[PDB]
Nucleic acid binder design. Sequence first.
RNA 1: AAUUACCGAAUCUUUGAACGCAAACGGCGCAUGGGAGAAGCUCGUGUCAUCCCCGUGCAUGCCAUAUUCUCAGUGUCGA
RNA 2: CACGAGUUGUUCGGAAACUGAGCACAACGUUAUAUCGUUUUGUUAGGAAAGUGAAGG
RNA 3: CAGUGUCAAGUGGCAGGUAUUUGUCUGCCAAAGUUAAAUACAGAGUAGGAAGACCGAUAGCGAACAAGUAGCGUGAGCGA
RNA 4: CAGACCUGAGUGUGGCAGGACUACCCGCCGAACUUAAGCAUAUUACUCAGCGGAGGAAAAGAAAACAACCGUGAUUCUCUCAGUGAGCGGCGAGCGAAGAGGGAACGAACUCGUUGCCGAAUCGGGUCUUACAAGGCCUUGAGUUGUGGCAC
Lengths: 50, 123, 55, 53, 53, 118, 81, 203, 51
Amino acid sequence: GRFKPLAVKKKYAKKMNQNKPVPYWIRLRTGNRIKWNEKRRHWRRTKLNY
Amino acid sequence: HMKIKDLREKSKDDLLKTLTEYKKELSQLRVVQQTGGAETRLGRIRPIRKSIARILTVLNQNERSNLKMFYADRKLRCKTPKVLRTKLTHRRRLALKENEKNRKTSRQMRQAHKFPKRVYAVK
Amino acid sequence: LKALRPQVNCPTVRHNMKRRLGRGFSPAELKAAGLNPQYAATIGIRVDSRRKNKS
Amino acid sequence: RLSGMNHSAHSWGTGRAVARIPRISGGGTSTSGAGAFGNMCRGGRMFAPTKIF
Amino acid sequence: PTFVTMQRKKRVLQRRLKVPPALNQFTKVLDRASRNEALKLIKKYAPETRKAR
Amino acid sequence: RKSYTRPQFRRPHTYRKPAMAKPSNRVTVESKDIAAFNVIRYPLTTDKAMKKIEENNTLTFIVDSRANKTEIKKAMRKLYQVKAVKVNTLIRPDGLKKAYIRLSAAHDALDTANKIGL
Amino acid sequence: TKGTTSMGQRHGRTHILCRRCGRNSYHVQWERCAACAYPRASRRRYNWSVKAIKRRRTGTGRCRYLKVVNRRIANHFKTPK
Amino acid sequence: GAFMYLNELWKKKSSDVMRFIQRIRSWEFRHQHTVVRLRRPTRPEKARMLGYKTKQGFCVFRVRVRRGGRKRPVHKGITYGKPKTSGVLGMKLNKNNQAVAEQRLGKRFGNLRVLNSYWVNMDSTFKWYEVIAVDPMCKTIRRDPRINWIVNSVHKHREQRGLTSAGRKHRGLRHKGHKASKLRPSYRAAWRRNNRIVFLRKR
Amino acid sequence: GKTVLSCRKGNGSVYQVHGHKRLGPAKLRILDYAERHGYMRGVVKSIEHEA
RNA sequence: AAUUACCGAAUCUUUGAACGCAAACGGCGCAUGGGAGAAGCUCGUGUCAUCCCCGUGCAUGCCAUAUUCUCAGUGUCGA
RNA sequence: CACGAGUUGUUCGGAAACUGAGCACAACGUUAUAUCGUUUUGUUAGGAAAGUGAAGG
RNA sequence: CAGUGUCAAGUGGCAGGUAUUUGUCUGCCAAAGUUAAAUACAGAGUAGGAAGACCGAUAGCGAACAAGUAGCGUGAGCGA
RNA sequence: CAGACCUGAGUGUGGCAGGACUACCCGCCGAACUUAAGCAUAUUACUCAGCGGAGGAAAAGAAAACAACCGUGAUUCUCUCAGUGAGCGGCGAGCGAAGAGGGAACGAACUCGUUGCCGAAUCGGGUCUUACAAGGCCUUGAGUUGUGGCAC
Ligand SMILES: [K+]
Ligand SMILES: [K+]
Ligand SMILES: [K+]
Ligand SMILES: [Mg+2]
Ligand SMILES: [Mg+2]
Ligand SMILES: [Mg+2]
Ligand SMILES: [Mg+2]
Ligand SMILES: [Mg+2]
Ligand SMILES: [Mg+2]
Ligand SMILES: [Mg+2]
Ligand SMILES: [Mg+2]
Ligand SMILES: [Mg+2]
Ligand SMILES: [Mg+2]
Ligand SMILES: [Mg+2]
Ligand SMILES: [Mg+2]
Ligand SMILES: [Mg+2]
Ligand SMILES: [Mg+2]
Ligand SMILES: [Mg+2]
Ligand SMILES: [Mg+2]
Ligand SMILES: [Mg+2]
Ligand SMILES: [Mg+2]
Ligand SMILES: [Mg+2]
Ligand SMILES: [Mg+2]
Ligand SMILES: [Mg+2]
Ligand SMILES: [Mg+2]
Ligand SMILES: [Mg+2]
Ligand SMILES: [Mg+2]
Ligand SMILES: [Mg+2]
Ligand SMILES: [Mg+2]
Ligand SMILES: [Mg+2]
Ligand SMILES: [Mg+2]
Ligand code: NA
Ligand code: NA
Ligand SMILES: [Zn+2]
């Protein structure tokens, strides 16, 4: 709905910014081990409930 | 880019003037970040930010040292702000000092003088 | 490294015939030898004021 | 002394067509309902654990 | 206030109860003129102060 | 003795010495001229922002999220020497604060935009 | 009936976020936290769950100040001339 | 000196004058709070023999406790298990009221150090003790060689660990030799010493 | 067994008085000096029903 | 030196025992010291009402103290 | 799925600023233990909880 | 040892492992206080070190990896 | 009349307590499963769970102690005493120590109260000696309802 505390709104904002793929140049570093974000979230799979 | 040796030579009024100039320069570089900017221009952001840190370090280090000397006089050291006092540890601040310890009664003091510990050998 | 100690007899009828080292010298023994107990405590002699010297 | 026993496992009992070995509680993971507390179970306690005395 | 009430009730109770002679002897005191003379003599022979000492 | 006219006793009124002002417990050096740079961060150059410059004499900025409209008006005067007649603010879904600043008719938003470097 | 139909009758929420510990364990009606007992001054700690104690103890976070004071102690509170 | 007369007088608590004085004092104490601060001790001789001195940094409090036996706090007086553990009213606390009073004062006032206490009065419902405390931040205390030992942090809340005279009394440390072998240095220490299994290397 | 209803009512809970609509306790005047020595005269203003 | 290692000088957002008052509110006070001020006043200056921003102090309890602070009591005296 | 964007208030809703069924900080009491009890039938607490209208020079 | 009742003596008192009364004998002097070392660290921590007839990725800590993480539960908790 | 003492308040100034950790250690509170081939005393156990409190260790500690000898001599710990011809126990299941002896450690001992002789010689606060001196000077401020000194 329309209502939410500002503190709640900021928590949702941070989760929106974290929901991104890994930059491509990360895979070219020496000794890299990362391929995908592995913490991607979708609104229909898992709920944050805050 | 400012050398630390030159900064310590400047006065407080001169330092504040330089701080404003570098702050203004950094703001103009943030505009370049939003639009398109040359790679050479964007490489100057980090040296500017570090120069600002050096100026603030010199100002704050001078200010603390002056106030410590100002409150060093016996008439004002009882009202020294708590941030300028030595930190140590909470328990160490409340512990007995070396002078408060080792206090002796008069009888104990005279006994120590009458029978001091000796150095001896056996053949 | 170790202070001087006296010689005592073990109690009970089972250890009557044995000898060992006691805690410290008695004030009567120190007086017989000609020593102040407080002074003797500073030159490496142990002092015990409880022992009785019954013989 | 704690290895292999750090779970809140319980037996399901008879009436379900499964063995009577204790099983991990909870849900949502691949280890939910798996066997526990046994020298024959994966992740379980060994038989006669070694001692220092 | 409570302390006012209690310090009055204590005097009332002390008057009401029965007082043994050892305590009662302190109620009967010396005459005013003799008390004044004794206090005058004591003040005449008062001890020295810190500055005087 | 004193005379009381109320059926219960209340605390009497006594002299009270006012508290003294202690030396300040914060000794960090702060500058007055630096503050305006913290309020205004950087402008926006999106398509919606560009339409407002030409058609409404309005500028768009990202500002400190804890600043209010009154402070934003003062910072605009101190940084760019322009007068703002109206400020509208919103907090974006990503957590940043955005301000639509309408300039007075005496100034031209397009001219100010060129000086900034848009 | 109990089961699937009754799952649609569940509205509202019993718990929200806690200001002190950050978990979704703050009881709205009773105004107290089921995880850290906020606003009581002390926190919950029970010996029948050592596993829960190890999840919340010192060292599971940042230790911003403890790292600094540990260095000063190891260097005997060194100071310049 | 005057001490002999005061001490001999306080050994006649059953005499008429002493009973009169104690009745007046008990009536007055009954209408006060549970904890009271005093300017001077009621029994100066006893306080001084227990360690009090008339100097800056010492203070005296009077603490009230309720008499009677302990009631076991179970719901509706219902116990479970073996019949041996079914008593609700006939059990007694394993710690004495003097220690209870000292612990109450110590828990209430955390900036002081408790030293000792003594019995002052008693009636049908209540008992009254006087507790001596010191302030460890006072310069007189910190510089006095006879009392400054209590400034050290190892003596913090020593009454909560049963280290006062009453605590020693109910721990049984009034006795030595064959009457205290199983409780020295403590019950738990003796229990560990007698129950741990010993494995020598070459056995 | 379980607790009987008559004993359960002693806890209070959902068995207390419904007093939201009530006007307050009904009582006489306070026995004061005027009532002890002379008399006081009052006027009846309203007559009402209480739930 | 956008190298590393160590450490004495510094910085250290919102909270939390959390302590000015509250709280699914980035909210609201008292005292004091500053800042900015397109009104009005005044000769682009100075000054500034309402509004706005910042620093510091302000929980409860207990101990000590007042160049000897201000008080209360049909408590005990005294003039 | 990827990249780039979008939420504008003196008057709209909330708070600032009401009271209700109710809650429980202080205070007091109790408990070996406060993490217990009382706290709107005009109303806390053996209970000294009011800090400024005018003044007056 | 604790609660309640009762409640002392005066160089006499306490202890001498079967209760009482009466004589000796031996040891010691309660009801106030401080105090290093030799001892513990059976699911602590800080700064450093040394090892093993141990395990070798279904083993060894739950975790050799962005592991108390992803995920589950209203919650206490559970947990790859 | 003013005033004084006693008992309580308000405010200013300088301080301290609440929280965290809790392996070991100190105080309280405190089970049942289990064994007895059943079970209630007993056992598990003066244990788990619960409530408090410190440290680098804690606690204990300078004889109202052992003994019954040709006597030993604060505390703590180790082997042994000893699974005991001790003792407790539906005398069943079971439970269960101390003195002595060989050792580790050890410069290990001191302080009040009381008694006798003194009696503010005491404490705090200002100020001055490079100094919040174990110092001088000044202080009614505290203190004679007793701080401090000298011998036991
Ligand atoms: K009175
Ligand atoms: K304490
Ligand atoms: K009066
Ligand atoms: Mg929601
Ligand atoms: Mg395993
Ligand atoms: Mg808006
Ligand atoms: Mg009771
Ligand atoms: Mg039971
Ligand atoms: Mg207690
Ligand atoms: Mg032993
Ligand atoms: Mg009702
Ligand atoms: Mg607050
Ligand atoms: Mg998508
Ligand atoms: Mg996007
Ligand atoms: Mg009621
Ligand atoms: Mg109401
Ligand atoms: Mg109210
Ligand atoms: Mg001790
Ligand atoms: Mg595999
Ligand atoms: Mg594995
Ligand atoms: Mg078992
Ligand atoms: Mg059986
Ligand atoms: Mg069987
Ligand atoms: Mg059975
Ligand atoms: Mg037992
Ligand atoms: Mg336990
Ligand atoms: Mg100790
Ligand atoms: Mg044998
Ligand atoms: Mg047993
Ligand atoms: Mg004397
Ligand atoms: Mg004396
Ligand atoms: Na029962
Ligand atoms: Na009503
Ligand atoms: Zn919480």
